């Protein structure tokens, strides 16, 4: 329809360039976020293209922007790469101003901000990347999970999934999850993430990657061995 250009509106009121931007997100690897009460776990599919691909120097799908906020992406990998760097200059700059580390609520606005800006204008295309930003505040210890989307609209979810057959993981999540009691133990919450990611890999225990953020600037990336034990618990019970 009115995809010939970005600035022109549409009888249907939907800017097509944003809608197609979403569609692009499904290209990239699945990423899932699940919050606990004392944890957030941020896991992502790390899809292996060939067996010649290094694990020596090849980028992880999960990138720390600052020392207590964590970020995964789903989308156009090319585009994500500058989006993550722009996020980061501001993030660090947040301390230049205030002499306070980066608050997760200020950070989601900013990431949505660079994106909103690109959409508003006409002489740039939007980012084809939806991101999940997980983290805790510096001041406090309650777990926080945010999303940005291409459009420049941001939300908070309890648990949320994006990229590569996102729908099927989303439904899976609803059924398993409880909002009355989110899991209050880091391990059980991890396990919920692994079960999700299992589905989209079909088979892999060397293609599931798990990262965790915990409060007070604890961020850790999990051993490939450690994830396989969790897969071992999930295959036996099934």
């Amino acid at each position: 329809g009115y995809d010939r250009a970005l600035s022109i509106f549409s009888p249907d009121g939907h800017i097509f360039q944003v809608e197609y931007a979403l569609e692009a997100v499904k290209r990239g690897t699945c990423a899932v976020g699940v919050k606990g009460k004392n944890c957030v776990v941020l896991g992502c599919e790390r899809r292996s293209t060939l067996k010649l691909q290094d694990t020596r120097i090849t980028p992880s799908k999960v990138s720390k922007i600052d020392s207590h906020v964590v970020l995964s992406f789903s989308g156009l990998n090319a585009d994500s790469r500058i989006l993550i760097e722009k996020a980061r200059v501001e993030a660090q700059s947040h301390r230049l101003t205030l002499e306070d580390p980066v608050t997760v609520e200020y950070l989601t606005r900013y990431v949505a901000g660079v994106q909103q800006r690109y959409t508003q204008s006409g002489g740039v295309r939007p980012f084809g990347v939806s991101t999940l930003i997980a983290g805790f505040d510096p001041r406090d210890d309650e777990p926080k999970l945010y999303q940005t989307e291409p459009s420049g609209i941001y939300s908070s979810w309890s648990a949320q999934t994006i990229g590569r057959n996102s729908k099927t993981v989303r439904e899976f999540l609803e059924k398993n999850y409880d909002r009355k009691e989110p899991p209050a133990t880091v391990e059980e919450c991890v396990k919920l993430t692994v079960r999700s990611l299992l589905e989209v890999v079909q088979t892999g225990a060397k293609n599931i990657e798990i990262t965790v953020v915990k409060p007070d600037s604890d961020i850790v990336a999990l051993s490939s061995e450690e994830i396989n034990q969790y897969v071992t618990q999930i295959e036996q019970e099934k």
Binding site: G28, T49, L76, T168, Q202
Partner: protein, 385 residues
């Protein structure tokens, strides 16, 4: 083998004995009535001479005359008289004159066109009902709007009102839509017309709507009848020419449909099925209800459903030697039933390289990889990576 024979036992004897009967009986039919029937033959013969000059009937005036226009060219002011009635004569019919004085001696002819061949199908499908297996919740939906008000009108007067008119089958490719139209029409034994919507575009300008008049002129005489317009998605951006089909025609063909299917004409008692792979391509007023009523949406068959569809295809096949059949289904997620028919196609192709006549379990696993590789492009994970 011995199960096949039980079926083969009835089939041979009964029809071949009827054949032997009919052969002897050609003579025998004449013998009980040969003085009403040959009496009638005599009187028929006497008035009409030879030859019987065929003309084509323009129109009758109801008073015992008609105006005919022969193919041999002269027009004649005939009489409707003798072995012919006013109800048997309707425009476009081909009437029988006696040569030496044109008196209408009968009508024995209505169709001989090449055109009507197109619309009709001399069909024999290799999959009939209950090889639509699975998605059964939604086959139940096409039944209610096609099959079951033909089969019992009882139910649709017990509820009162009209039986719902038509349907649109629409969704992703591979979801078994084609096989539905052909198989619900197997059940009913109604006249299955079939025309494609890439054959509703014409390479002559303004003949496109004349063709669309032909589809429900045909439907209405051979009724009760099931008109399949297959792929009416090809109306929105697929067209043969531009300076001898053009933009005017594409819109006109759709205007034409409106008048056929719920215009004055109304043309009650034609069940219409439209398969279209996208309903957001289709015209807003042709997806108006009360000419196609409710829409049935299909989606890439779900994980339990693809068990059904795998059993339909591998019933033909010689089965898996080790068995991994139940795990094939599991690996597939968000995938078509056409992937299943392309997988048993692909298993026996790998088998076909050997030109072995068996099929083993291991061919299955290979064949799934082969055909998944074909689907995914090198610029998808080029664009992305």
């Amino acid at each position: 083998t011995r199960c096949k024979l039980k079926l083969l036992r009835m089939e041979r004897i009964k029809d071949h004995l009827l054949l032997e009967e009919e052969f002897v009986s050609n003579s025998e039919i004449l013998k009980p009535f040969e003085k009403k029937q040959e009496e009638e033959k005599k009187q028929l013969e006497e008035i009409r001479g030879n030859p019987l000059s065929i003309g084509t009937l323009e129109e009758i005036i109801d008073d015992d005359h008609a105006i005919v226009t022969s193919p041999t060219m002269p027009d004649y002011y005939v009489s409707i008289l003798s072995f012919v009635d006013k109800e048997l004569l309707e425009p476009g019919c081909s009437v029988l004159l006696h040569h030496k004085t044109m008196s209408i001696v009968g009508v024995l002819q209505d169709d001989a066109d090449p055109m009507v061949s197109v619309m009709k199908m001399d069909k024999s499908p290799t999959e009939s009902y209950s090889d639509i297996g699975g998605l059964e919740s939604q086959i139940q939906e096409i039944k209610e709007s096609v099959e079951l008000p033909l089969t019992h009108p009882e139910l649709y007067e017990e509820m009162g009102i009209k039986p719902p008119k038509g349907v649109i089958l629409y969704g992703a490719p591979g979801t078994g839509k084609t096989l539905l139209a052909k198989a619900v029409a197997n059940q009913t034994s109604a006249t299955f017309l079939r025309i494609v919507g890439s054959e509703l575009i014409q390479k002559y300008l303004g003949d496109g709507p004349r063709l669309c008049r032909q589809i429900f002129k045909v439907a209405g005489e051979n009724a009760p009848s099931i008109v399949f317009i297959d792929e009416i998605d090809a109306i929105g951006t697929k067209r043969y020419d531009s300076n001898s089909g053009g933009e005017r025609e594409i819109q006109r063909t759709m205007l034409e449909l409106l008048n056929q299917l719920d215009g004055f004409d109304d043309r009650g008692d034609v069940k219409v099925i439209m398969a279209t792979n996208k309903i957001e391509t289709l015209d807003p007023a042709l997806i108006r209800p009360g000419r196609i009523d409710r829409k049935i949406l299909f989606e890439n068959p779900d994980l339990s459903t693809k068990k059904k569809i795998l059993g339909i295809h591998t019933s033909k096949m010689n089965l898996s030697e080790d068995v991994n059949l139940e795990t094939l289904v599991t690996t597939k997620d968000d995938l078509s039933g056409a992937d299943i028919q392309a997988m048993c196609t692909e298993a026996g192709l790998l088998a076909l390289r050997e030109r072995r006549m068996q099929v083993t379990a291991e061919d299955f696993k290979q064949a799934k990889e082969r055909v998944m590789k074909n689907k995914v492009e090198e610029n998808l994970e080029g664009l992305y990576l």
